Design a protein around this ligand. Structure first.
Ligand SMILES: CC(=O)N[C@H]1[C@@H](O[C@H](C)[C@H](N)C(=O)O)O[C@H](CO)[C@H](O)[C@@H]1O[C@@H]1O[C@H](CO)[C@H](O)[C@H](O)[C@H]1O
Ligand SMILES: CC(=O)N[C@H]1[C@@H](O[C@H](C)[C@H](N)C(=O)O)O[C@H](CO)[C@H](O)[C@@H]1O[C@@H]1O[C@H](CO)[C@H](O)[C@H](O)[C@H]1O
Lengths: 166, 167
């Protein structure tokens, strides 16, 4: 069954999903603010995470104003960060909309399509696979590029099994 | 391919979609306000609409506070309104979330699933089929249950099917 779930996530906290996100599903983070002059991160200004049941970081999205780049990576909870993917020019990805922003993640099975507002920033080839069962938004009150509380909206149960009888 | 399009629809206006909404696609209307004391509609307080290229109301969602009901219907541009599907108790459908609201419509090909926030309020069997080429949000600042501007976000190019054959 297709469904919509809404989660208010405060900076520095995580949430367990009522319905997991799998291939064909969508997850969008909504920020009621956009602070592109928040100062240097430590090293990250803001991070958004998709966790698998086992605790693995399936997708780690990190924004760094001082390096002017958006990082995408994965890792096991007790392991080292894997191969970092980078996309430069943070402001250009949010260009067109001020005072708010949205980050959408499409789970395509083999890759994660990340879209900031209307722009696809990267087709991220997965380094770790599995179902997303938890989300987190990490940042300090002072240096986050997003609002203190971000709202995560998930669209699940989207893929359909179509049986054909001959 | 999959894409996100954002539209900011002021009350009483409509917008053409850059990417049409078809089977497997999703549209969510976001309101920064929830005015359950907006007063009397005439008879509608607010309407959210998915239009076909010929102007047909593929899906008409009308919120009525005084009649305490959310109506779902369809009709051709030059045709009469068809069979209404009703959901009583407007407030109850939005319960749990205050100061704002979210209305999502899934185009499942044969039906339209309408969800208010996290609550699926109806699996509306289509009365008219076709792709959605435009959307509208109609109301007056005076009696709308939503904010003056409603943000509509469409997720398109979504369709994902796994085919299974038997003989
Ligand atoms: C402090 C710092 O700049 N750490 C980043 C840096 O780490 C190198 C390898 C070294 N350990 C150090 O300088 O401390 O460079 C790596 C990439 O080579 C990485 O960006 C380090 O930041 C970490 O990045 C991961 C995601 O890849 C997470 O964002 C961590 O929170 C972050 O510390
Ligand atoms: C004016 C009005 O409230 N009309 C609604 C009412 O019509 C009855 C039959 C009668 N003509 C009248 O009281 O004026 O009841 C019908 C359903 O029986 C319907 O809700 C009428 O409202 C119309 O509903 C359609 C959707 O079905 C649209 O919302 C129209 O804008 C609206 O006028």
């Amino acid at each position: 069954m297709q469904g919509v779930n809404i989660y208010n996530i405060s900076a520095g906290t995580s949430v367990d999903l009522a319905a997991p996100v799998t291939t064909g599903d969508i997850v969008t983070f909504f920020s009621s603010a956009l602070n592109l002059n928040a100062g240097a991160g430590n090293p990250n200004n803001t991070t958004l995470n998709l966790f698998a049941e086992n605790g693995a970081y399936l997708l780690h999205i990190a924004f760094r104003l001082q390096e002017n780049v958006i990082i995408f990576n994965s890792r096991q909870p007790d392991g080292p960060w894997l191969v970092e993917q980078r996309v430069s020019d943070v402001a250009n990805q949010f260009a067109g909309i001020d005072g708010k922003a949205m980050v959408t993640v499409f789970d395509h099975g083999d890759k994660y399509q990340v879209v900031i507002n209307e722009k696809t920033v990267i087709q991220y080839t997965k380094q770790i696979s599995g179902l997303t069962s938890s989300l987190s938004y990490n940042a300090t009150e002072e240096t986050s590029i997003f609002s203190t509380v971000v709202e995560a909206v998930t669209y699940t149960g989207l893929a359909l099994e179509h049986h054909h009888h001959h």
